[PDB]
């Protein structure tokens, strides 16, 4: 549920547009960068014998379709991400705005973590990402997670319980004097 900071860049002067998403507990959460390569959900199957290969390093965008549309999917959602990393991808970005159940499909499969980050972008934020993958000819995507600070909220419990400890003792001193 950790937020993902993903932005796109456009070489020409480089305009930069950013958006937010949520990391998923399927691949080791860390920063990555590469070119955006849209991948169709049906193109990431495994029964294919030989397929064309891309240059190593590319952030793949996969827009999931409705679960009822596909009665017998070739691979699981985690299988799609595992296939792409083998293909040469470095950070797979999903779009679960149409298949909400994929979030559970990813977070459930915590038994075998993946080596590279996996991100799902839902809501109207994926609409902007699709409007970029649809129009621009070349894009450059970086994903990062840099949560700073928290550093006073952590020591707040230590400071607060201490005053209660100090005051409860003073209560008994006043209680015992009059009795």
């Amino acid at each position: 549920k950790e937020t993902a900071f993903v932005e796109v860049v456009l070489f020409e002067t480089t305009y930069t547009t950013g958006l937010t998403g949520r990391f998923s507990r399927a691949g080791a959460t860390l920063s990555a960068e590469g070119e955006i390569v849209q991948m169709h959900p049906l193109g990431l199957c495994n029964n294919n014998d030989e397929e064309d290969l891309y240059e190593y390093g590319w952030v793949g965008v996969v827009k999931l379709e409705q679960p009822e549309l596909d009665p017998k999917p070739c691979l699981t959602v985690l299988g799609k991400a595992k296939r792409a990393v083998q293909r040469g991808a470095t950070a797979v970005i999903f779009d679960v705005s149409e298949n909400p159940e994929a979030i559970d499909q990813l977070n459930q499969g915590s038994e075998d973590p993946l080596k590279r980050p996996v991100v799902y972008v839902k809501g109207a934020d994926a609409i902007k990402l699709m409007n970029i993958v649809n129009k621009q000819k070349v894009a450059r995507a970086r994903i990062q997670h840099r949560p700073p600070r928290q550093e006073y909220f952590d020591m707040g419990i230590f400071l607060a319980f201490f005053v209660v400890v100090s005051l409860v003792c003073l209560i008994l001193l006043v209680k015992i004097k009059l009795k």
Partner: protein, 245 residues
């Protein structure tokens, strides 16, 4: 406390210290009011607080209350030392008013500098660090550090001097005040002296939190303990009960 006091030289010193305790409480209440109003919207009033006029008033009030907690206590040890040796009750108040008023010029001196308090919502001349008014922060800490030794050496000799049983209650009361003050204020300056030393580094989130709980604490516990630790307080409190009942 004030109504019970208003005479012995040892009795009149506590009333003036109670005034500084009330000043520190008024200062803390200012911050509490400015906090309770801004439920998550402090930044809207932040520029109005520093760039208005209250950032120079509250800081001066805090400085006046802080330095009174040392200047008023300095004479108590000399009073105790003179009490054990044997027209002085009217000459000690002459120095009392001078010590009380001496902190006004010290607090107003930063105001003459063109911009000192526009660096912290606390409006205090040391949470901002050491760059603003570098010649004032060091001197203020040095003034507090030098005064403690004179109070400590007199109390040290007071016990060895003894072998006025009714006056025994006051001797320990002054000792508690002069000792506990450096328990609540001496650790404060360590964090202020941290950013100016390369070897030791302290995060800013700690300095403000420590200041906000250790600056008003020393001027907050003395009046409460005065009720439960001074036997004369019982008679002083009972004296004024019949004057109204």
């Amino acid at each position: 406390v004030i109504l019970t006091t208003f005479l012995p030289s040892s009795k009149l010193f506590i009333g003036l210290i109670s005034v500084s305790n009330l000043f520190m409480g008024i200062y803390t209440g200012i911050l509490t009011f400015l906090d309770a109003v801004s439920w998550g919207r402090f930044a809207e009033f932040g520029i109005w607080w520093e760039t208005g006029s209250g950032c120079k008033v509250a800081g001066f009030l805090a400085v006046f209350s802080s330095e009174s907690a040392i200047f008023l206590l300095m004479l108590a040890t000399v009073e105790r030392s003179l009490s054990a040796k044997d027209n002085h009750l009217k000459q000690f108040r002459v120095a009392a008013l001078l010590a009380f008023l001496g902190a006004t010029v010290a607090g107003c001196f930063p105001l003459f500098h063109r911009g000192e308090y526009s660096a912290s919502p606390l409006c205090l001349p040391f949470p901002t660090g050491e760059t603003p008014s570098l010649g004032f922060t060091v001197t203020l800490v040095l003034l507090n550090s030098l005064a403690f030794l004179l109070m400590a050496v007199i109390y040290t000799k007071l016990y060895c001097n003894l072998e006025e049983n009714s006056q025994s209650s006051m001797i320990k009361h002054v000792a508690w005040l002069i000792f506990t003050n450096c328990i609540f204020f001496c650790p404060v300056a360590f964090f202020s002296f941290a950013p100016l030393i390369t070897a030791i580094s302290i995060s800013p989130e700690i300095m403000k939190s420590v200041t906000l709980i250790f600056f008003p604490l020393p001027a907050c516990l003395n009046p409460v303990l005065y009720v439960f630790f001074n036997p004369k307080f019982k008679e002083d409190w009972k004296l004024l009960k019949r004057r109204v009942t």
